Design a protein around this ligand. Structure first.
Ligand SMILES: Cc1cc(=O)oc2cc3c([N+](=O)[O-])c(O)ccc3cc12
Length: 327
């Protein structure tokens, strides 16, 4: 299996561009930067509102937890190649503690409101706006030969006052090479596509589109997370109860995959559940037939059938967002 678009990007570019292990970091002044208050926490890092002492400018200070050097160079090389692109977070400087040598990535300052508090308040149009903006980041990165692999709400920063969006946390992103076999333990359980759940390792840019589709479904149905599994196996069951098992079997036979007895017995047999059955009084103001048509084309077992970021931006669901930009 190979990407239907942008398959040769890295093929045509200098090795330096995609070869991140040969990277040698140029560090800066740690004391240029001061912490003011914590704003985030993760298994891989801690995040802080900071100050640049030189120019008295606000910034983002991300302090990384002890981790392998290769992962940290990868994220840095990717941030550099993406710097400047639409809606992507900007790496400004890189520093580290002398004594313990824990590194810190300094970014352009970004404002955010927790999504659990922000999503309940979003309008029909807001959702088209912010998704379009997100799709512009995704098409940019894919066009530069990169997969993000961790798309989910906590990774999209939104300053709703300025209606500015930034895709963050590039700690799990990778470069794409035709035929290459990737690691399936990427992304949050709730946002993992079927390829990651049936061990199909030669995935491509379309992984990100599945995750996007899950994010979108949670938003329009006001059910977050949309597919809510307690473990990986539970996750695939939850999906199969929605898309149906016929599509699953077709998918498995085309790539010639076979599920192990445990999972297979659990999946069982289920007829498709029509998207309309998910509409209720709590989300009725968000669900439209165009949103449904869009969503339908994103959540497809077969990664090769899924819309690209570029085709997706040309969907009529976004027709008004586009017209507002052409002026
Ligand atoms: C502003 C902000 C709040 C928060 O809770 O988590 C963040 C995480 C960020 C990350 N991150 O990798 O997690 C960035 O790479 C950049 C900016 C970020 C900004 C925030």
């Amino acid at each position: 299996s190979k990407a239907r678009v942008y398959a040769d990007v890295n093929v045509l570019r200098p090795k330096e561009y995609w070869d991140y292990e040969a990277l040698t970091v140029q560090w800066g002044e740690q004391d240029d930067y001061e912490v003011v208050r914590k704003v985030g926490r993760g298994k891989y890092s801690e995040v802080f509102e900071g100050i640049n002492v030189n120019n008295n400018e606000k910034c983002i200070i991300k302090i990384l937890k002890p981790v392998k050097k290769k992962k940290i160079k990868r994220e840095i090389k990717i941030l550099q190649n993406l710097c400047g692109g639409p809606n992507i977070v900007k790496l400004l400087d890189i520093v580290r503690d002398q004594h313990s040598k824990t590194p810190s990535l300094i970014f352009e300052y970004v404002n955010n409101t927790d999504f659990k508090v922000l999503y309940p308040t979003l309008t029909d149009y807001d959702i088209r706006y912010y998704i379009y903006e997100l799709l512009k980041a995704l098409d940019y990165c894919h066009s530069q030969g990169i997969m993000h692999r961790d798309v989910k709400p906590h990774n999209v920063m939104i300053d709703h006052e300025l209606r500015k969006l930034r895709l963050i946390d590039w700690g799990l992103a990778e470069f794409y090479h035709p035929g290459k076999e990737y690691n399936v333990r990427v992304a949050s359980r709730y946002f993992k596509g079927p390829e990651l759940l049936v061990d199909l390792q030669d995935y491509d840019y379309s992984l990100d589109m599945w995750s996007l589709g899950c994010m979108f479904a949670g938003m329009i149905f006001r059910k977050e997370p949309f597919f809510y599994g307690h473990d990986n196996h539970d996750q695939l069951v939850k999906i199969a109860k929605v898309l149906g098992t016929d599509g699953l079997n077709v998918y498995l036979n085309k790539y010639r995959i076979e599920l192990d007895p445990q999972l297979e017995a659990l999946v069982g047999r289920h007829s498709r559940k029509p998207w309309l059955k998910f509409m209720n009084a709590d989300n009725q103001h968000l669900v439209s037939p165009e949103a449904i048509d869009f969503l339908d084309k994103l959540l497809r077992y077969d990664h090769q059938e899924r819309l690209t970021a570029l085709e997706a931006m040309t969907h009529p669901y976004f027709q008004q967002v586009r017209a507002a930009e052409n002026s």
